[PDB]
Symmetry: C2
Subunit: 246 residues, 2 copies
């Protein structure tokens, strides 16, 4: 009939890698109508549909989950139906030939979110590095399971890597975590440093400066409630050198 | 092996209607990867892919054609490989629940094109009125084969229905030819009236006014060369009443 198992993000990662054999797998978008079917070669559609496909893959393996009603904020899937603060999964996809084109989240929303819901910082990002050839055959060249702090970095002029347009801050932007090329700007080494960057960015950004004063304390108390454990966020000025050039 | 037939636009229209049974047919976009396949419910992708599907349908029925290298101008298919001025096919698709969302062509380009290539006015438009339900099943609710003059009309403030933004003319826009509701603005009754609208629109539009003086003569001579037959384009002022309100 129906025997539904509960899985974690690491089990899903490992299952796709070993059991599905995702790295060697082949796939393609296809449109059927009447008695004719054709390949579909629209390249931008692949990234939006991998998330839907994992949905179908989970649902076909009887794996237990809920879906997120908010597209703007993480997560995409709740892997624990009874605990919606833990076992949280975000699916991301980008064309592997170029740098990662996905966004993490609007900075203003995310800086507020992680005070109210610090457990969002422990969301797992299942990232598909996909590729589509000229014939339309889609393949997953790379697959990753990473934390938000593992896929972001600092930038020039701001504490965290941002999308800034005409001096106005928008979305937190990912770095190139996978490159063996050792740049002057590496990814954040730990959660505390990422959060330290967020803290300072709150003050740097004129839009979010109004709630910069209390931010550190408010976050550390909120982390304590939800995790029953203190966390020490270093000052950005002390740790900035690890992530900048000079 | 391969027995390839030559068809005309009306034969293709009738074949789809009776032999394919397009009106009662069912279809859907679908993404395969590994061993999981899912429905794809992105609604904007359907319109772009019907054109590709007809390509596949022609190619699977051994039907002879060439494809157009220019997306901005008609046609999409050349149904006569030896005569690329005749048997020209444009495929259009719109969601049947709303009014037609497709464009005919940029007006500046099209006003110049029909002097150099008057045979473009005899292009056949195979128009798919499609629909996608909540489950993702695509159906062709209506199918039409029409001329450009049968799917356009006048508007308020210009001789032909246009997309105007801040007093700047862009694309020729289709009317609602299919509606049994008899509006004050009907579609053009014949080719000559459509062309009369184009002629006047050339002068009305400040961008194309520089070549408005000679336009009528230049067009009528060009029509004569290509068709070996004179054509009389009426003055727009005389016929405007048929297409306006007052
Ligand atoms: K997001
Ligand atoms: K066109
Ligand atoms: Na979400
Ligand atoms: Na074309």
């Amino acid at each position: 009939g129906s025997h539904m198992i509960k899985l974690t993000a690491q089990q899903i990662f490992d299952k796709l890698l070993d059991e599905e054999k995702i790295l060697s797998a082949n796939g393609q978008i296809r449109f059927f109508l009447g008695d004719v079917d054709i390949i579909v070669k629209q390249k931008d559609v692949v990234g939006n549909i991998i998330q839907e496909w994992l949905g179908g893959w989970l649902r076909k393996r009887e794996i237990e989950f809920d879906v997120s009603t908010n597209t703007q904020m993480p997560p995409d899937f709740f892997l624990n139906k009874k605990d919606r603060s833990r076992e949280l999964l975000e699916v991301k996809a980008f064309n592997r030939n170029a740098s990662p084109g996905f966004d993490i989240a609007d900075f203003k929303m995310y800086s507020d979110e992680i005070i109210h819901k610090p457990y969002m910082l422990d969301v797992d990002y299942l990232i598909f590095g996909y590729d589509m050839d000229d014939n339309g055959n889609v393949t997953i060249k790379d697959l990753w399971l990473k934390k938000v702090w593992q896929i972001t970095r600092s930038m020039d002029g701001w504490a965290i890597n941002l999308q800034v347009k005409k001096g106005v801050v928008h979305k937190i932007r990912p770095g190139v975590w996978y490159s063996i090329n050792k740049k002057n700007m590496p990814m954040f080494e730990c959660l505390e440093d990422f959060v330290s960057a967020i803290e300072e960015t709150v003050y740097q950004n004129p839009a979010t400066r109004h709630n910069a004063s209390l931010w550190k304390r408010k976050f550390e108390e909120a982390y304590k409630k939800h995790y029953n454990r203190s966390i020490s966020i270093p000052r950005w000025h002390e740790i900035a050198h690890k992530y900048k050039k000079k």
